[PDB]
């Protein structure tokens, strides 16, 4: 009875964590790719102004 | 009993779900903030070029 409830609850519990794990790692990778994009865009005109610093 | 060996897991996935949900909520929010900042920087560059457009 309640045993069956426990089995069902535990079995469904494992479902949510594992599926979310892949999404979490994909989010991390996409975040890092975008941050690298911005950093690459950041330093270029930064150095351009460094050259343009007082001409 | 056989109840506890699963109820242990039943409660166990609760904190798992909480951590995953708060982490993913923060991840999406900061990702969107980064995307907005990158969009702002790109628009800044392009429209700064076009506001110049020779004088």
């Amino acid at each position: 009875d309640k045993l069956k409830e426990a089995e069902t609850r535990a079995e469904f519990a494992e479902r949510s964590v594992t599926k979310l794990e892949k999404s979490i790692d994909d989010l991390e990778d996409e975040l890092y790719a975008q941050k690298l994009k911005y950093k690459a865009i950041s330093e270029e005109l930064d150095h351009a102004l460094n050259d343009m610093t007082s001409i | 009993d056989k109840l506890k060996e699963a109820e242990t897991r039943a409660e166990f996935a609760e904190r798992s779900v909480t951590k995953l949900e708060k982490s993913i909520d923060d991840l999406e929010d900061e990702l969107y903030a980064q995307k907005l900042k990158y969009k702002a920087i790109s628009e800044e560059l392009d429209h700064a070029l076009n506001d110049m457009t020779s004088i």
């Binding site: 469904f12 | 909520d25 999406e28 969107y32």
Partner: protein, 371 residues
Amino acid sequence: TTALVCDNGSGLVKAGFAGDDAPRAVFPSIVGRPRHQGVMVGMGQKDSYVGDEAQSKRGILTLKYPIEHGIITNWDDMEKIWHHTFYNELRVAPEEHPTLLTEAPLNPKANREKMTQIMFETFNVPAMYVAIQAVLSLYASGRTTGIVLDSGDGVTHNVPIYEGYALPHAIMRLDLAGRDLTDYLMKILTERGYSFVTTAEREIVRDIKEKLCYVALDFENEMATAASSSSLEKSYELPDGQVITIGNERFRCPETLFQPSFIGMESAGIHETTYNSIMKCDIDIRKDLYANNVLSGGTTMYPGIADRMQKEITALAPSTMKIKIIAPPERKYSVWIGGSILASLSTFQQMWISKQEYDEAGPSIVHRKCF
């Protein structure tokens, strides 16, 4: 004194004193007269078993819900249900307690007026107030904006709210809900041989729906998988043995929510009436409504609905907006928790419809300033 936060609902009456976390007494709202003759003398057989008592003697009763779709169709039975709720499940006389009923949006006026007239004349409460079932569910989430989809058992309604200002022109009320899903499940079970007809066996089909059905993330792929493998067939033991095996009826019953053409309804699913309700709003509050979509009500407890709905809305919505679906674990009692919070507020303490006010203006007071 303390306020009574009753919540009539349609399918489960939830009640309890204001200021707690969960309703004190939750029991089905069914009133069933016996139908056979009865030969034992002096057995103490009553003429109508209401509430949770008629879910144990349902073998010889004819259960009939007194609330069809939000509206109340049988006032005597509803009065009986209220009397039971006050006197036996809470054991507090109503002469010393304010009450806070709840009502679906866009309901007939006469229903609300009769409700207040009953509460003031028969039970003789000190003061009662009627609130829309979606604003409470928004209270419980601790938000102040957001568009709430409250898919109960009687009627599914979708009230958008921004900064506390409700948008009356964007409420989309649809009459598909848990009861129609129960009937459709009972109708598709006949494709394997299991026939449930009696009004008592509708409860068994409801239990099957609650324990087994789930919402598929992608419908066609699930239909193809269930037709080749057999990894989905879950079995269930009836109240007398003779286990049954549910195949692809598992995700076809709750799929009716997203394709109301299954039960012959014309309208669009709950995935598209939310987007339509958003698009009727102004152009500057659509981002906030997109980000704060709230789910409530019992029928939104299907395993896997918070992902299907998000996928559908993301397909419909513009690609830039972020779509987030708030699905708290305490979904079923969200309306009642919100009702408790609202009744516990100090600012709200002067909005009750005091009895002297009703005596001066009649039952039509509810449509007036005291909403």
